[PDB]
Amino acid sequence: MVLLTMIARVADGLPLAASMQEDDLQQYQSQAKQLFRKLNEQSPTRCTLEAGAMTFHYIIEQGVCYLVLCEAAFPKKLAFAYLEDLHSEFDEQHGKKVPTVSRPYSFIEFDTFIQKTKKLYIDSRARIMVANIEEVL
Amino acid sequence: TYLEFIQQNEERDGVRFSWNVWPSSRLEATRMVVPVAALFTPLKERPDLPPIQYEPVLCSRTTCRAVLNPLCQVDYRAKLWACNFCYQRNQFPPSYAGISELNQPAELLPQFSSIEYVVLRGPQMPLIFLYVVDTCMEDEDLQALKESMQMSLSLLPPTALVGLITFGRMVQVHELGCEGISKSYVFRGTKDLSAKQLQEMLGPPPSNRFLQPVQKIDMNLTDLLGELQRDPWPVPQGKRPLRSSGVALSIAVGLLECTFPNTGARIMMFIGGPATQGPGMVVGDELKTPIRSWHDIDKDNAKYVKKGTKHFEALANRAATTGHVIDIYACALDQTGLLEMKCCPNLTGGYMVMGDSFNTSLFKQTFQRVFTKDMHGQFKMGFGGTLEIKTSREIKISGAIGPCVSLNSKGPCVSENEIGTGGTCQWKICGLSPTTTLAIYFEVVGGRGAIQFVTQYQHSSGQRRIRVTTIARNWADAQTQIQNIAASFDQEAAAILMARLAIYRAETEDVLRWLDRQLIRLCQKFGEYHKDDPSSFRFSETFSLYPQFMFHLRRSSFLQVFNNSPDESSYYRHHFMRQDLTQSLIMIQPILYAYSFSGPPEPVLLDSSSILADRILLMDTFFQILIYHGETIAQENFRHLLQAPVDDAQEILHSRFPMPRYIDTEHGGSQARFLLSKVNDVSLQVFMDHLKKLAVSSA
Amino acid sequence: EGLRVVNLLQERNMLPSTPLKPPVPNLHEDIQKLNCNPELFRCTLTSIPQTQALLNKAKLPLGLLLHPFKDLVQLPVVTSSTIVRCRSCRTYINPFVSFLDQRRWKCNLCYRVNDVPEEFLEPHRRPEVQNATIEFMAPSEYMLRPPQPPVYLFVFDVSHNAVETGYLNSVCQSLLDNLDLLPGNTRTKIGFITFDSTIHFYGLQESLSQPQMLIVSDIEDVFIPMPENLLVNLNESKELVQDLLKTLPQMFTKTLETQSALGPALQAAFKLMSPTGGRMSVFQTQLPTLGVGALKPREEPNHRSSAKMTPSTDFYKKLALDCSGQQVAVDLFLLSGQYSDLASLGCISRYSAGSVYYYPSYHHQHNPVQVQKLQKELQRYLTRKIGFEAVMRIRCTKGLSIHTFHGNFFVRSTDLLSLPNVNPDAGYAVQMSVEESLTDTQLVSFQSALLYTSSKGERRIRVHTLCLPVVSTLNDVFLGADVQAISGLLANMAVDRSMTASLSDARDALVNAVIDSLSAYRSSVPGLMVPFSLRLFPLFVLALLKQKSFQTGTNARLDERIFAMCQVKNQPLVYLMLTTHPSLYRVDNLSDEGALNISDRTIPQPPILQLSVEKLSRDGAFLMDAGSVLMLWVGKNCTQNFLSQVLGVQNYASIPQPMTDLPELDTPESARIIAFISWLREQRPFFPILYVIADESPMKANFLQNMIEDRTESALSYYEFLLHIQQQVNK
């Protein structure tokens, strides 16, 4: 029921936009980048990975992977609706520049929309495939 | 007429006794079945008594100091009077030098057996209102709550001081009218604070930065109340909001305790759910675990109750000792924690309002009834009431049952056998109204026994006032003891006073076993029967309704707690321990009226046989007003019948303070269950038959 | 030029009339023409001793002084898909590498040969090899997290004393004027905290009619009261932060709060920034006396008290380390009129790569100097560029070892400097020693590199590389000595000797630095003979001993001395020289020998005078460039043309007592002196205020406290200093 959002270009795993808040992040941010590395043109376009007390959820559109991590208790139904809201906005704004950039995090300013959209999902008042993550790695 | 006597005495003195004739012997005082007790209403309204602006005149005897009353022997020639309690002869004060027999003091006329004095010596303190508002609730509930408090603000006296404390996960003590900011002091709702700590952490008519006159602050508070928003902290999935009610109250208590102790103040708490964090926690934040029930508490599956009840219990004693009132207004679909918080409005004079949502006409109307004004525009509420009772040397006081706190004042009128809040001749009542009814239980250790009720309280005008009710009842004639005693029995008042004793023992734990051994003992001592012949048993017209009252009491929701939530059980007993006689009777035995073409509306028995198919019923439980349509009527003459009970309902809907819940149901409707459960061991027929079998056999 | 020996006892005016210039390393023409700009990176000994035994003989300190984030006129920004770094020591590909196979290059720091990648393609024409100063784009592996946003948290003291100084009115005015100029993109966050006995947060929401002042009173157990709108988006909430800045000074006029809970407030300001990090601007005006981190009062010394510094608590040091681990840097604005234990408060800025700013006896009415000083120093503070969550590594060629670091940072792993912020006005220093004899090499290189997150959200690496020759002759070491750089490194070394030992031992080690080196020089060749490169060495050490950091017989107070030591540790070498030995010019008679090339401006170039009253003249006027201020002393018998045509006054008596700046009059005499002053302040970003207040009787003649060559009742003159050195050189 917490946060971790990464938007990367699937070809190289180039980070495009992310968002993290703590007050550890070091381990699951590693597995996130191990995943972006393995992802290729044959990977499932939608998936869910089990990481013990945590659980990854990602979709893929236009060669862009939208990854999210949370505690396994978080409704998987909501996680993909969260990634869908990110993609449609991100694709609408930066979909045509993704295959041209070469800097890491060339869309840091997408930080804004990530966190204002994130809050609409981590508050109950506001209102595919499964595989253990240790395998794919 | 013994009924004319009981009527007029309650109309004049606001009191009703179990027995109007008292045992003149030691052998009859010990063998009293229903104890000598009184249903006393210290502030009862009546036909415009003259407020006495002069000093009361008290007896000149250190231990006695009773108030001049109609039972005092006067001597207008010598300008003397003898105190009827201690026989002490007194001299009249200088203001009474012009005293004459053709122009006498009001306090001596038997019409003014109950009278009110006003003491105008010190400057009058302002009233203090402290809104303690929860923010963990839906927007429609919060916006409705915001609208309710803005309306109550527009009715407060301009001199009255106001404070605002909002809370959710944190507790916020607002500093009002700060200009360009509107700051607030934020505290963790996780650890408790004393009055002293809070005073350190925080800092011509008086006031504070936190408590300010309405006339100078109302415009800023009505804008703050309109800008209040829900607790900004998020609620994760499957979780309850972090709601720190236990600390928010202890901060409202400590705030007033260190700023205006010993003065009329109203801590009005508005709850939208249970306390999920800190001391005084009701339930954890896991939605998976439901709030406790009567089943859970009996099977030792409610780990928060005792620890939670104990927290608000000390808060109640703090605010009661300091002399402050704690109201609690709860409106949520789940439970709220009234079972653990009941001590605060019970030990003070605080109100306890319950509902499903602040966005109902049920709450909105009930809330504005709190601020009902009389013929002068002043609230029908008093503060800091001190009740002292003077008795003859033959009468001791076992104690009281009702909204009061013992001042632990010792004196010869204190009885060894203490009952309820006993062991004292003085009781503090932080809040009271014209309705507040105490239950005083006496014990006896020619003619006339005497009791005096002195109630000094802070009026809604700020004036210090003293109410003095002096009553007298004949001693039983020796050659006609039990015969005179039986003739004075008030079966209604005794049923409520015996119900008071039972609920008090249940709420402080069998109880039905005691309630039966006294109904049986009353049947044998005052009934008519041949031994071992149950068919022979009759009761006088004085005692005939007492068993039926006991039948509906022993099966009421006040003693059969299951099939109710603990918040509902504590809410039902709360209002019963405060109401007068007539409303208490309605709680135990709801009234039932019938409506049909065949005659005007008529009362009918609370039995299943009263439910006809071609008849509309009106049931009046104090807590709910129900209208039922028999199977036939469930479809200009049909209009009169269909709205005849509606017109009758609207009237009593308004006067009753805790606005009762209205129900429109019919045959087969789900809401018809409330009618079928109050109606009917088993039934009254079997109950009476088993009662007569034990009455006519051994004692 | 000059291999010549100088008899300091006979010369006496050895200070040149033109500005000192940094020495040129004895390097080949083609290697030197690519060497690092000496403003950004320089060494005390431009001729590195080949062995430690040779370094010990010269009795001179070997070390580096760097200004790595300095504003540049032109920066090569390489966006290379691959950053070429030596596979062993990770040194970046620098101009001083050794290309041999045209596809393999030798590292100039650890001598390992590396394969040039099939990207770098003539590989020697690559920009990474044609520039000693260059900025890279760091790839995804050089960042532990996404680029942190620019976060600015301003923590204001609002106690009774703080409200009396009136600083809050100008600070809020500066922020209003410089709101759009704060470095950052649309990801910029800004926050505000005021504190006295309690800690006051300020929530800002578009839904509410006005901000809200959330007060946490539990000083022993602080917390964040609201989760969302304490650090707000400056772009979205521009109007909300503007009303708060216009309202904040007015909220505390009638305050009776006499105490300050700085410790708890810093802890609260830390928790608010710990999630993201950023720059924490703390504005304190008095001794912290309430809560955790409380400091006891101290009695100020007098001229009579001898040399008998350290912090009184480690609270602000521990707290600074916690801020460093969260990429939080704390800048300390101290505007106190009384003692405030800056020796302890300074730890919050030293160990977190912050900078401390000191304004003694600040008052909005009583002290118009500190008012305009703060105004201009804040103008630079809020508008200068900034890098976030930074680290810095200082690399030097094998055999040389760095063993001591100087500056504001946290040192993690030897050669790993933590910079929660990096600012373009910070200076750093390093002390090295010859761990292994440089018999193999004749060149050694030095590399520093700055990994930081830009204000636009881009990981960048600014790299500087310096190459120097190796020598094995005592005279060769002396011929390459940098007298200014040695003065800077010795100042940093003496600050540590003060804390470590005392001000006496710090002053002795400074005096022994001149005695031991020149005694070693004499033993390798009647009067006092020094090499040409060390002819200003006793003069600059003397000025060091009369500076407010190390002076003794003066009436100086505790926080004055501590701040002077903080400026030694944190400022670039140029500002240490301009302060310790200010430049003195005569200005009442400027002419045309100037730099009249600049299109339409002439800009006189008057000669530099030495710091002695004997160079003054009651008939003229004298400007003194102290780096941060420009004091214009006027003579009692000054000319009449100067008064009416430059000062705009008809006589010396009606020169206003505090004069904040010169007038711009329609006179060519004014056009000259305004041209010289305006040219002096263009040589620096920190706008220096110029107060003519130095009259011959304004009671503000601290102008004369910089005449370091003259004698006073408790210090030697310059000639007395040479006399003392010579008795020790040939004892």
Ligand SMILES: O=C(O)CCCc1ccccc1
């Ligand atoms: O461990 C390291 O040195 C590589 C990371 C730190 C750094 C980055 C860039 C430049 C210098 C240093």
Ligand SMILES: [Zn+2]
């Ligand atoms: Zn008496």
Ligand SMILES: [Zn+2]
């Ligand atoms: Zn190398």
